[PDB]
Design a protein around this ligand. Structure first.
Ligand SMILES: C[C@@H](OP(=O)(O)OP(=O)(O)OP(=O)(O)OC[C@H]1O[C@@H](n2cnc3c(=O)[nH]c(N)nc32)[C@H](O)[C@@H]1O)c1ccccc1[N+](=O)[O-]
Ligand SMILES: C[C@@H](OP(=O)(O)OP(=O)(O)OP(=O)(O)OC[C@H]1O[C@@H](n2cnc3c(=O)[nH]c(N)nc32)[C@H](O)[C@@H]1O)c1ccccc1[N+](=O)[O-]
Ligand SMILES: [Mg+2]
Ligand SMILES: [Mg+2]
Lengths: 147, 147
């Protein structure tokens, strides 16, 4: 079976979201080679999923998941350009995820969606406490991988 | 505010899915100009949504939602080509939805995803009884409208 190998960004909830496999919210503190899960729109697939926040180029075999909106975590741009180095390609399947859209004092969503447009990818807001958007990420990245 | 004007296909649950606005399942029998709803990934939008199953060209102002998998409802192809006549365009924001993926004796999902690829759009399976996929449709069509 097809292997949906897809988590990246700055330091500050990349884990929590992936913690889809665990259906529960970590407020706790593992972040290095860290998941597998057995359908999406009726196609039966496995996933290989979490990076921490130099050369470990090594791992980006990869779709990319790639900030949490109370933090103007500029840093996405960086990630995205390091992958265009290794991957060597101006299009690689990918989702811009704004996490922690639950919280009050926050990044106004437009900003992002206009960068999103400027890379030409998904932009999906998301929240591992409330679940709101957890899987919306993952599952639109798969469907990408038309690629 | 931006107006997310998006339901189409053959006769045989286009309504039920739209019935997002009503969060409940119709097994009952209205199908002609039939919804509005006030966020998606943190962008605050309204929707204007249901067609029945000649010239009423009139309505496809439109994103297109466009079969229910126990019915080999061939008919998507037709829809999709009538819109490339009116809309005049080989790319128009759009989601291929396989509805009623709940049911037992069913269209094998691959088939579709390979047509999907062959048009270059989303293909999302979906189910208004179980909710599974209701909003997955709607909300990925919006994000399309990068267009
Ligand atoms: C070491 C490095 O760790 P890191 O691995 O770079 O950090 P992660 O990106 O994995 O982030 P993690 O999933 O550990 O969650 C971080 C914190 O934000 C909270 N959080 C995550 N998602 C949400 C959400 O949607 N809502 C809310 N309200 N909070 C959320 C978590 O519960 C947690 O307290 C790291 C670097 C800098 C700062 C922290 C940090 N860390 O791991 O704590
Ligand atoms: C007149 C024309 O009507 P139509 O408007 O072309 O038909 P719709 O596409 O709007 O279809 P509708 O939403 O009315 O649902 C049709 C039937 O399939 C069921 N259904 C819809 N979604 C699901 C689902 O995900 N799961 C299950 N198990 N069943 C589902 C409904 O509960 C209902 O009994 C029409 C044409 C032909 C046949 C029927 C038909 N009709 O309206 O009944
Ligand atoms: Mg971590
Ligand atoms: Mg109807």
């Amino acid at each position: 079976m097809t292997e949906y190998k897809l988590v990246v960004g700055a330091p500050g909830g990349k884990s929590a979201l992936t913690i889809l496999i665990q259906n529960h919210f970590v407020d706790e503190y593992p972040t290095i080679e860290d998941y597998r899960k057995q359908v999406i729109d009726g196609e039966t697939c496995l996933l290989d999923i979490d990076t921490a926040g130099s050369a470990m180029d090594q791992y980006m075999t990869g779709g990319f998941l790639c900030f949490a909106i109370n933090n103007t975590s500029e840093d996405i741009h960086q990630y995205r350009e390091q992958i265009k180095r290794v991957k060597d390609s101006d299009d690689v399947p990918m989702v811009l995820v704004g996490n922690k859209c639950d919280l009050a004092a926050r990044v106004e969503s437009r900003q992002a969606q206009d960068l999103a447009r400027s890379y030409g990818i998904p932009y999906i807001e998301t929240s591992a406490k409330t679940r709101q958007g957890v899987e919306d990420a993952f599952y639109t990245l798969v469907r990408e991988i038309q690629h």
